[PDB]
Design a protein around this ligand. Structure first.
Ligand SMILES: COC(=O)CC1CCC(=C(c2ccc(O)cc2)c2ccc(O)cc2)CC1
Ligand SMILES: COC(=O)CC1CCC(=C(c2ccc(O)cc2)c2ccc(O)cc2)CC1
Lengths: 233, 10, 238, 9
């Protein structure tokens, strides 16, 4: 596997260069405020984002080395986590706001349209605020997102764990360059990875709410999104 | 099969 | 706070001494297992474990410093996580089996009694096998379990009570590294092992959520009597 | 709130 020969800087540059673009939402409406309208915009945005994620995943060092079916499993398992940490990352420089798209900036009041959305919004905003106070860097973000991809579905494998250790080495290397002490390095590393437990929690809770939407047949989600959904049951 | 299958090898 | 002034070794001994006992289950090997009896045994067991967990949480450094309302929140949030990591810890030296109790040793074949249970069981088994391969130490386990208690519900609360929790969490991280350094691990090995342990917590969270929604479903399916304490813990996740 | 009671004492 080529991914293990990579240096820390080679790992960073590979992840940064593989970053998906920031997509736009459908322009105009009435500035949502209906259950079908908002969930429609989010579903449309997420569906287009998934296409870029799949190509982003293929560029994550070590992901190509896995079996196709193993690639499917990891993506099916982590896709909402990856979407959320991206949303949370974009929403960093916008306190109290969730930047789904540059033309779609939401607060918790706009989540009252959908039942259970305010709860998830508050958790997402809390994560973004956590990222902000930690002053999360982009180099750290792309490592966290790659970790989510490889880790979330590994227990549902020697190669993956080897790559996971590689990303850990990269994270430490990033913090060492930032002038962090040895104590500050393992502390920040722990702080970052503990947030992943919450991203998992938000994804699980957020997933369930996508189920009830599918059963209510309120929003026409794509067949791709439906297949990513069925895999979690 | 899956759409995800197609998109992973394109 | 006293927790912030605790040394690494003082932290370990404190967590070790606060360890809850391994409770036995009501189990009759003679009696035939049904998809309501076996769930009843686990429910009866978990309910009694909850009482020890609550008193265990009191002895976790920094936990008593928190407001009573936040103590409730943290436990309501992580109770199944803590039960599961305990279960996984006990089941480490029993490959392909889950030690719910010293007299209750289950495998995947007997998890088929309940629907959806076999997926949870396989995830628990995998987590146990993961701990076994890592050769997880008891001193590391009690650190991880205490991390779950403090971390799992910290982002679902100008209280400023969150800062104290993060300060304690950092102290526990210092403790883990101190343990690995004493085990002869190199600096790279320390950070790697630390990362490996904390990533498992993400999976334990996943198992808890999946386990929680399966507890909430059979609550509506009156086949199993959930205890009054357990019902209130379930209501918290809504 | 049973959890609340047991936490007090
Ligand atoms: C009950 O309401 C909630 O849970 C809100 C929750 C918000 C986040 C989320 C989604 C989402 C929404 C609809 C879908 O079909 C697919 C993904 C999302 C969308 C874009 C993005 O970049 C990241 C995530 C899921 C929904
Ligand atoms: C539906 O099938 C399942 O998901 C199985 C799952 C197994 C583990 C679990 C439980 C559990 C089971 C029933 C309850 O009412 C409370 C706790 C548990 C019990 C004790 C313990 O020390 C750790 C965990 C939850 C159930």
């Amino acid at each position: 596997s080529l991914a293990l020969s990579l240096t820390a800087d080679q790992m960073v540059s590979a992840l940064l260069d593989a970053e998906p673009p920031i997509l736009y939402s459908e322009y105009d409406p009435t500035r949502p405020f209906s259950e079908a309208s908002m969930m429609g915009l989010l579903t449309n945005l997420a569906d287009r984002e998934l296409v870029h994620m799949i190509n982003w995943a293929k560029r994550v060092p070590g992901f190509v080395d896995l079996t196709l079916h193993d690639q499917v499993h990891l993506l099916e398992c982590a896709w909402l986590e990856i979407l959320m940490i991206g949303l949370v990352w974009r929403s960093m420089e916008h306190p109290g706001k969730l930047l789904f798209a540059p033309n779609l900036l939401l607060d918790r009041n706009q989540g009252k349209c959908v039942e259970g959305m305010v709860e998830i919004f508050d958790m997402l905003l809390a994560t973004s605020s956590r990222f902000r106070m930690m002053n999360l860097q982009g180099e750290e973000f792309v490592c966290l997102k790659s970790i989510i991809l490889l880790n979330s579905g590994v227990y549902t494998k020697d190669h993956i764990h080897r790559v996971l250790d590689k990303i850990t080495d990269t994270l430490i290397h990033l913090m060492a360059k930032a002038g962090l002490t040895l104590q500050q390095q393992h502390q920040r590393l722990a702080q970052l990875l503990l947030i992943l437990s919450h991203i998992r929690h938000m994804s699980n809770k957020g997933m369930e709410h996508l189920y009830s939407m599918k059963c209510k047949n309120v929003v026409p989600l794509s067949d791709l999104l439906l297949e990513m959904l069925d895999a979690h049951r | 099969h899956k759409i995800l299958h197609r998109l992973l090898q394109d």
